[PDB]
């Protein structure tokens, strides 16, 4: 067979997968995927037949109910989604190599003829609010608005939910939580505000940072009330105290928060549409929002009539061409992002009249795994790991800001360094077991041995760890001034993870006020248009602190949903 449908139709009728009229149920292919499941079982049952010791196409870290058509198309060869970040040994039937080729919004001007037909038609749906993007901010805004009594449609251009938020690991910052108090941490919204402003080099909009710090506990409470576990509180770079919240044991905050949000949206019967891209915000004759033109992958263009549109589309850190124009020093770097994080949501915001700000500030995460090409959480360092160069020495305060850590790593021999930790650090953060499972954390029972395996001066590394453990024991790092020294590296075996910087997060984006209203260049509100999450600018100034983006998307996502519902 040349394709999956041809294979099945050798023994099956068209309606084994299709509806009675033959029309595709919707752009999520809901009915069609139910038929795959009726014969093959759920994703979890299929995964029992495709086990590999350390990986499995059908049982991943992605949250929500991943549709089979996310990777298996019927009438044409299709791509494995995991290939966008990993290169696992897979043999999917009718596969084709991963290639992301998505037209820009500007390029979609070529469909002017089909777009005009869509716009001349009646709206396909008439609702109160449309949320664009199924990352943490968009689910938060959909739930919030629905809970306030608004009828929402939440759209997502990708085949799978959660954007980059599902990838988040280190935590969600918040101050003065009940969770901190149970771990005996003392903090305050004022101190979180202070750390954030200083970390962003005072470029941050202070009114936006006040919303971030003051709503932070409430956002933690809201998520927890919805079923989230945010009881583990760790340290991330640039924070005066531990305030990065995550599930018990140090599991990744991201996939968990998005799973909780999805489950809550499903419980509320929120109309969620996959493979549906927002293209153009429509405005009436007085310039207020009247709806949005969308492009369904399977159904074509159509528009939704609504009072409000909430853009929650994420950043543009996968788009190296846009990134290099703004910061030529990041040209050619690998990204930590999902494949659709290219900034089309910003183009939608701008075409609607929204202005952008702080676009030149682009964050590189200092620690991408060289071997795996994926982000290694900063929580590995916050929980006690050090960084060594190939000479087996420390060279930087490992919990300094991201700008300084990336430069210090790139200044080392080979333009990369190694995270070094022991079993005490490993046991303190369960996320570390995920790097070991990926095969990117070689181990040995001595540093001399570990060094020999990874090309690190073994005898200098041994000395380096003994010296660092002495500083931990005395409580002051006189070599690099790391202000938090939580553990000695002296339990069990040792591990090394080769790391280098990668493009991660875009601090700039659409200008919003404190009600998450999108504004134009004259600082005028565009009635009905909201923005929330990494697509906005002004919250994080020149450098975002680790943990502050998950805090931002919940707080601003929730706020946008409530304001949009009220506006109506
Ligand atoms: C690997 C990784 C780990 C991280 N860890 C942390 C952490 O621990 N703490 C922290 O503070 N931050 C962390 N960050 C950053 C944080 O995850 C993000 O900034 C992300 O959660 C922002 O969420 P968001 O909702 O704004 O956007 P995203 O979660 O990226 O979701 C936006 C969604 O919009 C969809 N979309 C985009 N354009 C359109 C369009 N035109 N039409 C329809 N849909 C569209 C995208 O496909 C995407 O699904 C991490 C980021 C990454 C990449
Ligand atoms: C889009 C929907 C579906 C998906 C993604 C899917 C997936 C697949 C895949 C990848 C294969 C292996 C192909 C090969 O080896 O070349 C397969 C085979 C098979 N499929 Fe499907 N399938 C779908 C729908 C269905 C339905 C509706 C039925 C039954 C009515 C079905 C029954 C089978 C059977 C019997 C086989 C052969 C192997 C076996 O006995 O399990 N599939 N399917
Ligand atoms: C000869 C039998 C079939 C016919 C005539 C048929 C017809 C079609 C048509 C016309 C489309 C495009 C619809 C549109 O763009 O609006 C489509 C798409 C689709 N069909 Fe089929 N179909 C058949 C068998 C199957 C089978 C056996 C499967 C699953 C194993 C399947 C699953 C799908 C899916 C998932 C889509 C969405 C796009 C894609 O994945 O290719 N169909 N079909
Ligand atoms: C319930 C949902 C799905 C169904 C029913 C389904 C069906 C199947 C089947 C029947 C096979 C062949 C297994 C065999 O050798 O007998 C297969 C293989 C595969 N599928 Fe799926 N699939 C689903 C979802 C997905 C998704 C969402 C992805 C990607 C994220 C994916 C990627 C693959 C890959 C890469 C292979 C080859 C596995 C390997 O080489 O280990 N599938 N699928
Ligand atoms: C269904 C698709 C995928 C599969 C089956 C898969 C598989 C895996 C596996 C086996 C690991 C090692 C730890 C573990 O067992 O979970 C891992 C880790 C990781 N993967 Fe994926 N992957 C998928 C897609 C992606 C994509 C598209 C991205 C990036 C956008 C990504 C980002 C990461 C990261 C950052 C890690 C490090 C550990 C963590 O943060 O949990 N993965 N993946
Ligand atoms: O877990 C991390 O290293 C990423 C945190 C962040 O981007 O805030
Ligand atoms: Na931004």
What SS3 string covers 93-116?
Answer: CCECCCCCCCCCCCHHHHHHHHHH
Sign of CA dihedral 137, 141, 143, 147: positive
Q: How far is CA 212 from CA 166, 519, 540, in A?
A: 20, 19, 10
Name the residue of 20, 29, 34, 75 whose CB sits within 8 Å of the most ligand 3 atoms, as the mutation to test its pocket.
75
Name the residue of 11, 15, 17 whose CB sits within 8 Å of the most ligand 3 atoms, as the mutation to test its pocket.
17
User: What are the E-state strand segments in 353-485?
Assistant: 356-357, 362-369, 386-388, 417-421, 443-444
Instruction: Indicate whether residue 74 lines ligand 4 (CB < 6 A).
Output: no
The minimum-distance atom of ligand 2 relative to the CA of 11 is 35
Q: 40 C-alpha vs ligand 2 centroid, how far in Å?
A: 7
What is the residue whose two structure tokens read 């038929």?
35
What was the experiment behind these coordinates?
Answer: X-ray
In this structure, are residues 307 and 37 in contact, taking their beta carbons and an 8 Å threshold?
no
Q: What is the dihedral of CA 314, 549, 551, 308, to 10 degrees?
A: -20
Whose C-alpha lies nearest to ligand 5, atom 31?
A: 85
In this structure, are residues 168 and 257 in contact, taking their beta carbons and an 8 Å threshold?
yes
> End-to-end distance of the chain based on CA atoms, in angstroms?
52
Tokens linked to 386: 């050090």
Q: Which long-range contacts (CB under 8 A, 24 or more apart) does 515-523 make?
A: 515/559, 515/563, 516/310, 516/556, 516/559, 516/560, 516/563, 517/563, 518/311, 518/349, 518/352, 518/354, 519/354, 519/355, 520/353, 520/354, 520/355, 521/355
In this structure, are residues 84 and 102 in contact, taking their beta carbons and an 8 Å threshold?
no
Q: 430 C-alpha vs ligand 5 centroid, how far in Å?
A: 15
Tokens linked to 462: 């041994």
In this structure, are residues 64 and 161 in contact, taking their beta carbons and an 8 Å threshold?
yes
Which ligand is the nearest neighbour of the Cα of 86? 5
In this structure, are residues 138 and 261 in contact, taking their beta carbons and an 8 Å threshold?
no
Rounded Cα gap, residues 375 and 228, in angstroms: 23
What SS3 string covers 462-518?
Answer: HHHHHHHHHHHHHCCCCCCCCCCCCCCCCCCCEEEEEEEEEEEEECCEEEECCCCEE
Residue 80: alpha-carbon gap to chain centroid? 19
Whose C-alpha lies nearest to ligand 2, atom 41?
A: 40
What residues are paired with 426 via a beta bridge? none
Which ligand is the nearest neighbour of the Cα of 43? 4
Which ligand is the nearest neighbour of the Cα of 314? 1
Instruction: Indicate whether residue 69 lines ligand 3 (CB < 6 A).
Output: yes
Q: How far is CA 222 from CA 105, 191, 199, 331, in A?
A: 35, 22, 26, 39
* DSSP assignment letter at 187: -
Q: How far is CA 525 from CA 152, 288, 515, in A?
A: 22, 10, 10
Tokens linked to 525: 């509100």
Domains in the chain: ranges and CATH = 1-99 (1.10.1130.10), 103-359+506-568 (3.50.50.60), 365-502 (3.90.700.10)
In this structure, are residues 262 and 270 in contact, taking their beta carbons and an 8 Å threshold?
no
Instruction: Indicate whether residue 90 lines ligand 4 (CB < 6 A).
Output: yes
Which ligand is the nearest neighbour of the Cα of 72? 2
* DSSP assignment letter at 78: B
The minimum-distance atom of ligand 2 relative to the CA of 12 is 30
Instruction: Indicate whether residue 298 lines ligand 3 (CB < 6 A).
Output: yes
What SS3 string covers 254-299?
Answer: HHHHHHHHHHHHHHCCCEEECCEEEEEEEECCCCCEEEEEEEECCC
Buried b (16+ CB within 10 A) or exposed e, 499-523: bbbbbbbbbbbbbbbebbbbbbeee
Pick from 180, 265, 267, 191: which is nearest to 230 by CA? 180
* DSSP assignment letter at 431: H
- With H, G, I as helix, E, B as strand and everything else as coil, classify residue 440: coil
Ion ligand 7 — residues with CB < 5 Å: 506, 509, 534
- With H, G, I as helix, E, B as strand and everything else as coil, classify residue 166: helix
Q: How far is CA 228 from CA 147, 231, 338, in A?
A: 17, 9, 23
Q: 160 C-alpha vs ligand 3 centroid, how far in Å?
A: 20
Side-chain-side CA neighbours of 39 within 13 Å: the count stands at 9
User: CA-based angle 201:314:339, to the nearest 5?
Assistant: 120
In this structure, are residues 410 and 500 in contact, taking their beta carbons and an 8 Å threshold?
yes
Q: 403 C-alpha vs ligand 6 centroid, how far in Å?
A: 13
Helices 548-567 and 136-147, packing angle to 10 deg:
30
Whose C-alpha lies nearest to ligand 1, atom 41?
A: 278
Q: How far is CA 2 from CA 10, 96, 361, in A?
A: 12, 12, 47
Rounded Cα gap, residues 109 and 303, in angstroms: 16
Whose C-alpha lies nearest to ligand 5, atom 14?
A: 434
Q: 80 C-alpha vs ligand 4 centroid, how far in Å?
A: 9
In this structure, are residues 385 and 441 in contact, taking their beta carbons and an 8 Å threshold?
no
Rounded Cα gap, residues 160 and 501, in angstroms: 26
In this structure, are residues 34 and 103 in contact, taking their beta carbons and an 8 Å threshold?
no
Side-chain-side CA neighbours of 25 within 13 Å: the count stands at 15
* DSSP assignment letter at 335: B
Rounded Cα gap, residues 529 and 345, in angstroms: 13
Name the residue of 1, 2, 3, 4 whose CB sits within 8 Å of the most ligand 2 atoms, as the mutation to test its pocket.
4
Q: 532 C-alpha vs ligand 1 centroid, how far in Å?
A: 11
Catalytic residue numbers, as ranges: 402
In this structure, are residues 358 and 538 in contact, taking their beta carbons and an 8 Å threshold?
yes
Whose C-alpha lies nearest to ligand 3, atom 35?
A: 74
Instruction: Indicate whether residue 29 lines ligand 3 (CB < 6 A).
Output: yes
């Amino acid at each position: 067979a040349d394709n999956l449908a041809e294979f099945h139709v050798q023994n099956q009728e068209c309606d084994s997968c299709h509806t009675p009229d033959g029309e595709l149920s919707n752009d999520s292919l809901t009915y069609e995927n139910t038929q795959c499941v009726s014969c093959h079982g759920t994703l979890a049952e299929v995964a029992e037949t495709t086990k590999h010791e350390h990986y499995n196409a059908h049982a991943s870290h992605f949250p929500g109910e991943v549709a089979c058509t996310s990777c298996h198309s019927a009438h044409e060869k299709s791509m494995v989604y995991c290939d966008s970040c990993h290169s696992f040994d897979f043999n999917m039937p009718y596969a084709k190599k991963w290639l992301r080729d998505e037209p820009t919004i500007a390029e979609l001007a070529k469909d002017k003829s089909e777009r005009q037909a869509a716009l001349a038609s009646a709206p396909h749906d008439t609702v109160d609010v449309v949320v664009v993007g199924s990352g943490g901010a968009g689910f938060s805004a959909a739930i919030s608005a629905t809970d306030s009594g608004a009828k929402v449609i939440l759209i997502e251009k990708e085949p799978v939910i959660g954007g980059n938020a599902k990838l988040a690991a280190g935590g969600m910052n918040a101050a003065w939580t009940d969770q901190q108090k149970a771990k005996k941490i003392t903090d305050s919204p004022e101190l979180m505000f202070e750390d954030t402003m200083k970390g962003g080099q005072n470029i941050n909009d202070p009114a936006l940072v006040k919303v971030l710090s003051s709503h932070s506990k409430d956002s933690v409470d809201w998520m927890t009330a919805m079923g989230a576990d945010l009881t583990d509180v760790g340290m991330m770079g640039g924070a005066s105290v531990n305030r990065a919240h995550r599930p018990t044991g140090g599991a990744g905050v991201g996939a968990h928060v998005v799973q909780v949000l999805y489950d809550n949206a499903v419980k509320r019967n929120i109309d969620l549409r996959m493979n549906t891209r927002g293209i153009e915000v429509l405005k009436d004759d007085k310039g207020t929002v009247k709806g949005i033109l969308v492009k369904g992958m399977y159904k074509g263009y159509y528009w939704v009539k609504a009072d409000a549109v909430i853009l929650a589309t994420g950043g543009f850190a996968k788009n190296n061409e846009r990134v290099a124009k703004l910061d030529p020093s990041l040209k050619g770097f690998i990204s930590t992002n999902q494949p659709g994080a290219v900034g089309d949501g910003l183009d939608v915001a701008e075409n609607a009249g929204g202005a952008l700000k702080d676009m030149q500030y682009i964050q590189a995460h200092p620690t991408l795994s060289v071997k795996g090409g994926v982000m290694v959480t900063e929580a590995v360092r916050g929980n006690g790991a050090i960084l060594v160069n190939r000479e087996g020495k420390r060279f930087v305060n490992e919990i300094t800001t991201r700008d300084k850590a990336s430069a210090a790593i790139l200044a080392q021999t080979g333009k990369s360094a190694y995270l070094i930790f022991d079993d005490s650090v490993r046991k303190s953060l369960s996320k570390i077991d995920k790097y070991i499972g990926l095969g990117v954390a070689p181990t040995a029972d001595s540093l001399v041995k570990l060094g020999k395996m990874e090309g690190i001066d073994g005898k200098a590394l041994t000395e380096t760890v003994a010296r660092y453990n002495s500083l931990v024991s005395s409580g002051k790092d006189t070599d690099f001034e790391r202000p938090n020294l939580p553990r000695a590296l002296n339990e069990g075996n040792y591990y090394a993870i080769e790391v280098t910087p990668g493009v991660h997060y875009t601090m700039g984006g659409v200008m919003i006020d404190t009600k998450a209203e999108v504004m134009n260049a004259k600082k005028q509100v565009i009635p009905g248009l909201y923005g929330a999450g990494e697509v906005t600018g002004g919250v994080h100034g020149a450098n975002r602190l680790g943990g502050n983006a998950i805090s931002d998307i919940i707080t601003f996502g929730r706020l946008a949903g409530e304001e949009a519902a009220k506006y109506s």
